[PDB]
Design a protein around this ligand. Structure first.
Ligand code: FAD
Ligand code: CL
Length: 448
């Protein structure tokens, strides 16, 4: 039986552990944090995420989709809150087949942990990877106190998140060709109680957005009708605009309250613990990191956030990591040797990871901030009705299909240019020749 060591019992790490163990691999998984299934007196984490077709299909192959969706809230559409006008639901698709699921992160992690152990994997908690000696095939782990433990390894999988210790150890034996692009936005997690959401009639089966240009708020529902709110705001005010809002200008919780009362007046009354949450929850950091190399021969490989950190403006990070886990287990199972598998996995997944990283950065302007946009959207809806197998909106290709990310991006660019050109010198749809646009659709877009 083939042997494998995995670092990180997160979302990608636990899924890949189950897929390999059920195929007869001898699997050992190491996690820095304690086992979350061991109940303590401490408060549970209220963090949630948007699960789409890519992530759901990966769970379906693993035999875990039913268990996960049993505790997921259906999001049928987007609820945009702009002051003055009441919110109106913008449905994602034709029916409840085209939806996104809101799931508690800790609940998903516990289901995955149970799944990896049921398949035969051994999980070791309270052990963080410190360093790797590739030539001697040994690694060093330690608990929070710093007490060290050495282990021999054969194949190493880096599923240890955006600040990966496996990636740091690899950078010493190979040039990874790393390119980091910092993000000016920070984030803060806040809460809406079940009592407050019900009092203010906040729709439970939708994803909520409070757009405000350079900054914004999003809210995802929980099973108990509570909501997890995320504020996206610049860490620092720029030199060009010194008076602009930023985290630096929000010295305490009282400062945060006055800011919300002024910029988000319909959201502020729903945030009862705004002051406490602002001061106790730390500000998170965002970035895009691109690597030319994801592996070291047949010895080590990276996947998920360890391989491709991305901005969270498309809700596809977890979805991508689960898709990576399926591809890695498939390559390792059927290759001539581990070196061949790691090279082929890297070649297949790298162009897709670059495509989703670029699409996530582009999606920020869509969520946070036109007469020309509405005409393009109207013509795009008609083209999708005439040719539903050729004209599929980019958001729909990413979120509701398994088309490779690079293909979704390429087809999306063809459609965006087709719509832009068609409306360019026209006041309204009555002056636009619909059959001529349809001809461009059939000429430039093959059926799927
Ligand atoms: C604000 C925000 C919102 C998001 N919303 C969404 C969303 O709606 N939909 C979506 O698809 N994605 C979303 N994402 C992205 C998503 O959270 C991540 O992409 C995903 O968790 C990555 O999975 P992973 O397994 O690669 O890493 P992780 O889930 O981060 O797991 C890494 C694991 O490794 C462990 N670890 C770290 N270092 C070590 C070490 N040295 N030794 C041992 N163990 C270690 C960690 O404790 C952790 O358990 C969001 C991200 C952010 C920041
Ligand atoms: Cl994301």
């Amino acid at each position: 039986a083939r042997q494998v060591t995995i670092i990180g019992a997160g979302l990608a790490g636990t899924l890949v552990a189950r897929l390999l163990a059920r195929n007869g691999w001898q699997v050992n998984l190491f996690e820095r944090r304690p086992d979350p299934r061991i109940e303590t007196g401490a408060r549970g984490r209220s963090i949630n995420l948007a699960l789409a077709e890519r992530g759901a299909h990966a769970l379906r192959l693993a035999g875990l989709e039913r268990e996960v969706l049993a505790e997921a809230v259906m999001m049928r559409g987007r609820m945009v809150h702009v002051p003055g006008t009441p919110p109106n639901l913008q449905p994602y698709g034709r029916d409840d087949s085209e939806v996104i699921w809101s799931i508690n992160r800790d609940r998903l992690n516990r289901i995955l942990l149970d799944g990896a152990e049921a398949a035969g994997a051994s999980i070791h908690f309270n052990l963080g990877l410190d360093s790797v000696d590739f030539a001697r095939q040994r690694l060093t782990l330690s608990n929070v106190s710093g007490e060290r433990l050495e282990k021999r390894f054969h194949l190493l999988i880096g599923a240890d998140g955006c600040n990966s210790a496996v990636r740091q150890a690899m950078a010493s034996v190979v040039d990874l060709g790393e390119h980091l692009e910092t993000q000016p936005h920070g984030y803060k997690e806040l809460q809406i109680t079940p009592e407050a959401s019900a009092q203010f009639n906040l729709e439970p089966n939708a994803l909520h957005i409070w757009p405000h240009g350079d900054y914004m708020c999003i809210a995802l529902p929980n099973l108990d009708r509570s909501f997890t709110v995320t504020l996206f705001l610049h860490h620092q005010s720029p030199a060009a605009q010194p008076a602009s809002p930023s985290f630096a200008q929000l010295v305490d919780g009282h400062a945060a309250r006055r800011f919300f009362q002024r910029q988000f007046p319909d959201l502020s009354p729903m945030l009862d613990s705004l002051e406490q949450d602002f001061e106790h929850h730390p500000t998170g950091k965002l970035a895009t990191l691109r690597l030319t190399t994801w592996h070291v021969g047949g010895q080590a490989v990276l996947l998920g956030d360890a391989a491709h950190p991305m901005v969270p403006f498309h809700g596809q990070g977890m979805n991508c990591a689960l898709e990576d886990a399926v591809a890695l287990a498939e390559h390792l199972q059927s290759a001539a040797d581990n070196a061949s598998a790691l090279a082929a996995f890297t070649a297949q997944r790298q162009p897709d990871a670059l495509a989703i990283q670029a699409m996530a950065l582009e999606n920020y302007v869509e969520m946070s901030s036109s007469p020309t946009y509405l005409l393009e959207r109207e013509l795009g809806q008609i083209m999708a009705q005439r040719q539903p197998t050729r004209f599929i909106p980019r958001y729909s290709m990413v979120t509701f299909s398994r088309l490779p990310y690079a293909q979704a991006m390429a087809r999306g660019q063809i459609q965006e240019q087709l719509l832009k050109f068609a409306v360019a010198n026209h006041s309204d749809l009555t002056s636009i020749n619909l059959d001529a646009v349809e001809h461009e659709v059939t000429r430039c877009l093959p059926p799927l």
